[PDB]
Amino acid sequence: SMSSLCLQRLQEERKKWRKDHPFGFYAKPVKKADGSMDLQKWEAGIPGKEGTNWAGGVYPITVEYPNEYPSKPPKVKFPAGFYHPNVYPSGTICLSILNEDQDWRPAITLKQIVLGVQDLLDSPNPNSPAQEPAWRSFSRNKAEYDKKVLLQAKQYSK
Amino acid sequence: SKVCRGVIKLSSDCLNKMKLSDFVVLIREKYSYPQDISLLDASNQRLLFDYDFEDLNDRTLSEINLGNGSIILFSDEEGDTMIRKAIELFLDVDDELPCNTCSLPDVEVPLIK
């Protein structure tokens, strides 16, 4: 039930990515039972920035494309339970460029998405409290926050 | 109306011996595609082969779940100004043409922006 434009744009995304993707990132369509690839569901990894508490970790996301892509944005998820003020308990990332009613435009490449997610790691957005306990720590117990973050960096070590 | 179309006539014998790598070779040289291509199962929408995904290179058409009435999408994936139009290919296997039959249809596939 993917539109032919969706198929066309997804094949191009995979191609632009090959030619040009940020250093240390990876993104690849999932392999299915039969041995073939699913262009609608991708696995990617986001390296934490150096000189920040996220350094050393490579953080796994899944990028899931709707049948109406690129009219509608992908759904991007860390694993459920991932710790960050702008990540839901389910793992869904809250980024304005991923919201159809906000800053998403069909021209947005997978590169722009992964760089946006990476920038979010160390700079949480106050207009998106998505995880209560993480927001509480960040706001009033920064030493408990930092510590949790450093643990998560070790958990997702390269 | 953008994707070109054609029916391939195949043998039931040919579907079990045809290697995916050579199947790509045949399609590329008939319609003048460049080196970097991608090959989809157009029905269930699985990616089966491209310039980087070569896991299925060695398998036969039946070994990658392509049978009677399966449709294939073949695209230009070079990223140049002039791009060869995509062609969609139906797989009609009848009983029986001489075995080892794989006749590609005559299709006028243009170079577009």
Numbering used by the authors:
A (entry chain B): 0 to 157
B (entry chain C): 439 to 551
Question: From the publication, what sentences describe this entry?
Answer:
A transthiolation reaction ensues during which Sumo is transferred from Uba2 to the catalytic cysteine of the dedicated Sumo E2 conjugating enzyme, Ubc9. In addition, for both yeast and human Uba2, the ufd has been implicated in Ubc9 recruitment. Therefore, to obtain a more detailed understanding of Uba2's ufd interactions with Ubc9 and to obtain broad insights into how E1-E2 specificity is established in general, we performed structural analysis of the Uba2ufd-Ubc9 complex from S. cerevisiae.
The structure of the yeast Uba2ufd in complex with Ubc9 provides the first crystallographic insights into E1-E2 contacts in a Sumo pathway. There are two molecules per asymmetric unit, which superimpose with 0.3 Å root mean square deviation (rmsd) over all alpha carbons, so only one version of the complex is discussed here. The Uba2ufd-Ubc9 interface is interdigitated, with the two V-shaped grooves from Uba2 binding alternating regions of Ubc9, as in a layered sandwich.
